Amino acid sequence: EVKNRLDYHISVQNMMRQKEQEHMINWVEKRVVQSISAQQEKETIAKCIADLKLLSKK
């Protein structure tokens, strides 16, 4: 009977945190996914590391 009280609160906080985590995540990511043309250089670093692939694969 002692356990029954406790684990409910834990479980609710756990599921609640995941339903925050997902909800914040999609909302943040769905808001801020814009600056790729503002900073091109995420594809310049693609071409940088990609040149260190195109050279450094073999």
């Binding site: 002692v2 009280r5 406790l6 609160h9 834990i10 906080q13």
Partner: protein, 121 residues
């Protein structure tokens, strides 16, 4: 756990039921066996909770910790006798049984044997 054999008893019991309880004992035997097998099965005591995990990682610990203290302080009684001067009405019934039958019967048998002497003939 709770019971035991005394004399010879679960078998040696059931057959033999003093008339002043005789009828009762037949029913009582079967009741007893029910209790016997049941008790032997049950758990005797559970675990006793790993607090370390729960206190740290259930972080409503104001609630948890207060309930903890109340649980750790929590004291427990035992169950209740009700039916155990039967245990003692036993020593009384044991008189009845031996001396009350022992004696009178021993004097009776005394006569039967003395009469055996002549009737060899």
């Amino acid at each position: 756990r709770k019971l035991a054999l005394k004399t010879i008893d679960w078998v040696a019991f059931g057959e033999i039921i003093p008339r002043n309880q005789k009828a009762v004992a037949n029913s009582l035997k079967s009741w007893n066996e029910t209790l016997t097998s049941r008790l032997a099965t049950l758990p005797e005591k559970p675990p006793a909770i790993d607090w370390a995990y729960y206190k740290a990682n259930v972080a409503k610990a104001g609630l948890v910790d207060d309930f903890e203290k109340k649980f750790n302080a929590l004291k427990v009684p035992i169950p209740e006798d009700k039916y155990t001067a039967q245990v003692d009405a036993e020593e009384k019934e044991d008189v009845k049984s031996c001396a009350e039958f022992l004696t009178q019967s021993k004097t009776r048998i005394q006569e039967y044997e003395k009469e055996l002497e002549k009737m060899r003939n």
